[PDB]
Design a protein around this ligand. Structure first.
Ligand SMILES: CC(C)(COP(=O)(O)OP(=O)(O)OC[C@H]1O[C@@H](n2cnc3c(N)ncnc32)[C@H](O)[C@@H]1OP(=O)(O)O)[C@@H](O)C(=O)NCCC(=O)NCCSCC(=O)O
Ligand SMILES: CC(=O)SCCNC(=O)CCNC(=O)[C@H](O)C(C)(C)COP(=O)(O)OP(=O)(O)OC[C@H]1O[C@@H](n2cnc3c(N)ncnc32)[C@H](O)[C@@H]1OP(=O)(O)O
Ligand SMILES: Nc1nc2c(ncn2[C@@H]2O[C@H](COP(=O)(O)OP(=O)(O)O)[C@@H](OP(=O)(O)OP(=O)(O)O)[C@H]2O)c(=O)[nH]1
Lengths: 6, 164, 769, 156
């Protein structure tokens, strides 16, 4: 669930 | 009865519609048109199988070493429609996603970020599959949660798409 | 001097010193004005960006070639494709060196349709960069599009020859999604010609070791081998391809024709046994061969032997793993099936085998939702839920039920008490907040679902995350939370005159907001296709055209996808009504964080104050919405009923006849709506006889056009003399209640004839419709 | 693993205990108190799920300093009908009476209501006894009813 915010 | 397809670009509207209904991961429509338009072969989707369209039920997006170093594979987000889970679904949509992630592009070590707080994932995801851990990144998630890393070595012959 | 500015980014604060200095004596000059603006967009302010880009297009007509390209690098960014081609051409036919312009453009006029003059202006780059294979594709992707496959197929086999007898790890993915793709083209000429094919099969047989797609080839080999009457050699590829991912049918059913044994059940049913034995317990082996059987002695063996087991373990698709065989073939199955379940609920002593009594009830409390026995669909669910109350998959079945018998409110309650069973895991956190948006409860919908959506609410941060599930669900609230708020200022005829002036606001605040909400659902698709830009000329570095040649063919049919559709038709019935009605502030500044769509830059009309009442909603519904989806939509998939309303409510109608017609060659004249969609057009200027004439030209004999003129013949009965239960086609006649005058005759023979209908819907066409 | 496992009741759960209250111990504990368990006195918890899907419940406090009723209380302990029966929630006591010597605490309090002879003639059969006597207008559910209590005890 790779976090593109952080 | 979920069918396990090879993921097309037609299924980005209906793919991302699920990893959003069922997940706290807001993702844009670019970052789907480049998983499935760079390395479109080894990212699988699977949902509804009716004959004599289809409904999204579960999917599997899997990028490689996007950032810069011995051919590393990754897996971005994975989910499934609740009224469908605990029936494989998740649990053998990835034994193909690896089983292509070292067949086409041939990458030696998988990787990812599973939360936990989590049963479903951090179980048949290190006991069925076997996938150590590596760095437990703290607050690496967008909720103050800390989430396991998970590495997973892959050498072709010791992971084929028909060991079941 | 600006060279240090133009290099100051490709954040070009250096360009300020130009607009501070270069605006010394000579001011009105391009080159310097244009950086000042390309920056603006690569620097926040878009509003203030054009007052330069455009305040510098009034000092040209061409201009400083070196500068026309810091103008076309913006047009290519303010979406303006057609116009960008020009700003570039205005470098090239002005003496520009940067010969990479024949590839900054060719990845633009390629998108905007012009595929003919895509190759000519792309191949012209290919010469100056011919030591870079990620170019030797576009001279064979555009040629392969234009329709000369030999100039495509030969331009890439003059790659496979050059370059070297050498392909290191850089191109270790090149000779795969490529010199296989060649076989997709180098065979799609043969079609059904034996002259090629063998070779296109012997070529596909040559690489194998060099083809690295493993799957994805088996089809232009393992079905070209089936295309030349050698049913084996391929039945021995699908038999090794079924064995590659047997959890998918696609490659399994074919094998029935691969072994020619399509219509030979007797070996067919047995084929999936010497199977089941092989590839153990994976869906296909068992399922497929129970959709083609005929024996209340045999069928009930493989029926029971598929079902029960899933029950004793607790599977939620224990039903929806068969909710298919209940649809395309009932009567035969949902008898054997209804009797092979309850007949097993006799030794489930709920204090001995419980994970069986709890779940072999949420099957029956799902099975008896098909038959719609409803009464016996809240029994099992409830009685199941009166044993284990900690299984959120009962409340869903209770809130599907209960919500299909109307009680929309009460249903989401049986869902909220399911949500509260687990805060984290938005698996129901939306579903619970779907139903409480289908009861108009937009408040304990926003809170109760904003909890995991990052302001002062949710519905604001769910626009920059796509989320077209929610909007076109939040309008099918507002659009239904208006025809009732707007049943107040039309019902009455101190707090009674002051109350009209309150409840007769929200009609403005929703019809305003509800249309303003659907524009976000289009705009995404506007910008879904408008983000396939950087991929024209950077899916080639990757070397992935086979997949890419599916994106372009996804692009045209993008504007006719699932959620653009229901977001048109559920919008039409709100736009179409503002063009047949015009013919015949502290709450605003204090409640503006509960209905906020986008930043305070763009959305200057909070409640679509403009959208709510625009000079002509016709050249709005077409530019915004429709006349894009009508340019793309394929023929045998285009709602004609909408089509016959769009050209009617504009003025055309001439098109209504060549629109109502082509609806007939789908149904066949004795359908419901085609009757109503003729009747209306019984008889714009004089020169609109022509409709009647042509209407009377062909379709004179059947059905009828000869009492249209004369006050006759109370055709309510005739309009329904084919044949009463066409309630699809009745509703029509009232929707437009003004050119179809008898008006208090049809509301009964619309209302009184919805008995044998679903309650949630039977009482939906009421109150609003 | 056997059938009846358990775990700690993470604040993501809770509502599967409120539901597992208001069913086990009907009309007892206010409709927000449990939210007030993790929002100075230390208060244990544990939701005992079985097979896979939850089916029991226990969430008990810890009193130390006036003597007589020191140690670990038992705010509620129950499990759903047609379950307990099969040991699914007899074992929670062993993981609550454990907390006594394992957290250092001689006794364990369990203020069962008066009538509940079914419960008061069973809990007795585990290591408990009617310490003291009856009470008077003591138990009162979030409704308006009232009952007497019955106390209990067990040292270690
Ligand atoms: C996490 C899921 C995808 C799992 O899907 P699934 O269909 O249950 O996978 P599966 O059928 O292969 O289950 C494998 C195992 O998980 C176990 N399992 C399934 N559901 C649960 C549950 N709710 N709690 C505990 N264990 C569970 C199950 O017992 C099975 O055991 P075994 O393999 O020994 O038979 C699904 O529950 C889901 O969509 N969850 C919400 C989305 C999510 O959390 N996704 C993963 C996020 S992290 C990875 C990236 O993304
Ligand atoms: C207000 C408060 O603060 S606390 C409220 C207390 N709770 C209540 O008032 C309502 C409780 N509701 C109930 O359903 C129950 O009474 C509970 C949960 C408290 C206790 O029930 P259980 O977990 O059944 O007790 P348990 O499992 O220990 O055993 C019950 C009997 O079955 C027997 N048993 C144990 N395992 C099994 C088995 N596998 N098969 C058959 N019998 C068994 C035991 O020996 C015991 O026998 P006994 O009654 O003669 O001693
Ligand atoms: N896929 C999906 N379906 C949803 C969602 N929300 C509600 N539904 C339900 O799905 C049904 C819509 O029709 P279909 O799309 O044919 O259902 P199907 O997938 O099972 O074929 C409705 O009835 P139903 O409740 O399923 O009852 P029943 O028709 O199963 O008796 C509706 O209430 C959702 O987010 N996703």
């Amino acid at each position: 669930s790779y976090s593109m915010e952080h | 009865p979920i069918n396990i397809r090879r993921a097309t670009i037609n299924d980005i509207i209906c793919m991302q519609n699920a990893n959003l209904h069922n997940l706290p991961e807001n993702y844009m429509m670019k970052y789907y048109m480049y998983h499935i338009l760079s390395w479109p072969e080894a990212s699988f989707v699977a949902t509804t199988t009716t004959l004599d369209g289809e409904k999204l039920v579960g999917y599997v997006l899997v990028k490689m070493n996007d950032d810069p170093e011995p051919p590393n594979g990754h897996i971005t987000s994975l989910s499934v429609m609740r009224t469908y889970r605990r029936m494989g679904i998740a649990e053998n949509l990835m034994r193909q996603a690896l089983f292509a992630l070292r067949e086409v592009h041939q990458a030696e070590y998988v990787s990812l970020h599973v939360r936990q707080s989590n049963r479903a994932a951090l179980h048949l995801y290190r006991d069925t599959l076997a996938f150590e851990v590596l760095s437990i990144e703290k607050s690496y998630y967008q909720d103050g949660e800390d989430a396991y890393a998970m590495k997973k070595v892959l050498k072709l012959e010791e992971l084929q798409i028909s060991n079941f | 001097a600006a060279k240090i500015a133009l290099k100051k980014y490709n954040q070009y604060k250096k360009s300020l010193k130009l607009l501070d200095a270069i605006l010394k004596k000579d001011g009105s000059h391009v080159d310097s004005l244009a950086l000042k603006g390309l920056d603006l967009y690569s620097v926040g302010e878009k509003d203030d960006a054009a007052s330069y880009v455009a305040n510098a297009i009034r000092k040209i007509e061409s201009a400083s070639p070196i500068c026309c390209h810091v103008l076309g690098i913006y047009m290519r960014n303010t979406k303006e494709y057609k116009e960008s081609i020009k700003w570039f051409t205005a470098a090239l036919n002005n003496g520009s060196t940067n010969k990479q312009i024949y590839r900054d453009l060719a990845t633009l006029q390629s998108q905007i349709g012009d595929f003919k003059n895509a190759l000519v202006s792309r191949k012209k780059y290919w010469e100056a960069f011919l030591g870079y294979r990620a170019n030797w594709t576009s001279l064979a992707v555009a040629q392969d599009v234009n329709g000369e496959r030999q100039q495509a197929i030969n331009t890439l086999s003059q790659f496979e020859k050059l370059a070297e007898g050498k392909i290191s790890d850089s191109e270790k993915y090149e000779h795969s999604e490529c010199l296989m793709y060649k076989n997709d083209i180098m065979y799609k000429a043969a079609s059904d010609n034996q002259d090629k094919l063998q070779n296109v099969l012997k070529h596909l047989n040559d690489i194998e070791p060099c083809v690295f797609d493993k799957f994805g080839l088996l089809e232009r080999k393992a079905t070209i081998y089936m295309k030349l009457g050698q049913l084996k050699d391929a039945s021995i590829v699908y038999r090794t391809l079924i064995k590659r991912n047997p959890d998918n049918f696609k490659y399994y059913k074919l094998l029935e024709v691969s072994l020619g044994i399509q219509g030979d059940n007797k070996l067919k049913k047995a084929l999936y046994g010497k199977l089941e034995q092989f590839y153990p317990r994976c869906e296909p082996p068992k399922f497929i061969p129970l959709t083609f059987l005929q024996d209340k002695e045999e069928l009930s063996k493989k029926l029971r032997e598929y079902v029960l087991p899933q029950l004793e373990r607790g599977v939620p698709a224990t039903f929806s793993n068969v909710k298919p065989l209940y649809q395309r073939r009932k009567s035969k199955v949902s008898p054997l099936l209804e009797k092979i379940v309850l007949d097993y609920l006799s030794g489930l002593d709920p204090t001995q085998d419980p994970i069986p009594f709890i779940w072999t009830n949420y099957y029956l409390s799902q099975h008896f939702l098909f038959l719609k026995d409803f009464p016996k669909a809240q029994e099992y669910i409830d009685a199941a839920l009166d044993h284990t109350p900690t299984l959120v998959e009962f409340y869903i079945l209770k809130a599907r039920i209960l919500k299909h018998l109307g009680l929309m409110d009460t249903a989401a309650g049986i869902l909220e008490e399911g949500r509260q069973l687990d805060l984290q895991d938005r698996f129901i956190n939306c579903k619970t907040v779907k139903y409480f948006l289908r009861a108009n409860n937009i408040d304990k919908a926003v809170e109760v679902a904003s909890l995991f959506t990052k302001s002062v609410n949710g519905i604001k941060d769910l626009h920059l995350v796509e989320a077209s599930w929610f909007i076109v669900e939040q309008a099918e609230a507002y659009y239904r939370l208006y025809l009732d708020r707007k049943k107040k200022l039309d019902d009455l005829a101190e707090q009674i005159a002051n109350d009209i002036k309150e409840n007769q606001w929200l009609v403005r605040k929703y019809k305003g907001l509800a249309l303003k909400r659907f524009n976000a659902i289009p705009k995404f698709y506007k910008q879904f296709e408008d983000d396939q830009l950087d991929f024209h000329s950077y899916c080639m570095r990757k070397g992935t055209p086979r997949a890419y040649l599916e994106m372009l063919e996804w692009g045209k049919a993008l504007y006719t996808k699932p959620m653009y559709v229901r977001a048109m038709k559920e919008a039409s019935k709100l736009y179409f009504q503002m063009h047949d009605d015009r013919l015949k502030n502290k709450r605003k500044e204090t409640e503006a964080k509960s209905v906020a769509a986008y930043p305070s830059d763009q959305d200057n009309d909070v409640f679509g104050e403009k959208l709510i009442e625009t000079s002509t909603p016709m050249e709005d519904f077409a530019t915004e919405f429709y006349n894009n989806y009508s340019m793309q939509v394929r023929e045998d998939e285009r709602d004609y009923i909408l089509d016959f309303e769009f050209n009617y409510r504009i003025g055309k109608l001439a098109l209504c006849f060549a629109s109502l017609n082509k609806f007939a060659k789908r149904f066949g004249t004795t359908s419901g709506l085609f009757g109503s969609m003729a009747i209306v057009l019984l008889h714009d200027p004089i020169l609109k006889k022509v409709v009647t004439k042509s209407l009377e030209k062909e379709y004179s004999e059947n059905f009828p056009l000869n009492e249209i003129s004369n006050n006759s013949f109370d055709w309510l009965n005739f309009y329904q003399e084919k044949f009463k239960n066409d309630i699809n086609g009745l509703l029509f006649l009232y929707r437009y209640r003004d050119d179809v005058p008898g008006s208090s005759n049809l509301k009964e023979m619309i209302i009184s004839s919805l008995s044998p209908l679903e309650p949630h819907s039977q009482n939906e066409i009421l109150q609003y419709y | 693993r056997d059938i009846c496992t358990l775990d700690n009741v993470y604040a993501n759960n809770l509502g599967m205990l409120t539901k597992l209250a208001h069913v086990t111990v009907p009309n007892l504990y206010q409709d927000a108190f449990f939210s007030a368990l993790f929002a100075k006195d230390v208060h244990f918890t544990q939701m005992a799920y079985y097979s896979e899907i939850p089916v029991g419940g226990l969430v008990a406090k810890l009193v130390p300093k006036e003597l007589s009723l020191k140690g670990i209380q038992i705010e509620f302990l129950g499990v759903l009908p047609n379950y307990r029966h099969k040991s699914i929630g007899s074992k929670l006591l062993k993981f609550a009476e454990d907390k006594c010597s394992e957290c250092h605490q001689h006794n364990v309090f369990v203020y069962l209501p008066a009538v509940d002879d079914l419960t008061k003639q069973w809990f007795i059969a585990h290591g408990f006894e009617q310490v003291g006597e009856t009470v008077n207008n003591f138990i009162k559910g979030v409704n308006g009813d009232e009952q007497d209590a019955i106390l209990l005890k067990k040292h270690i």
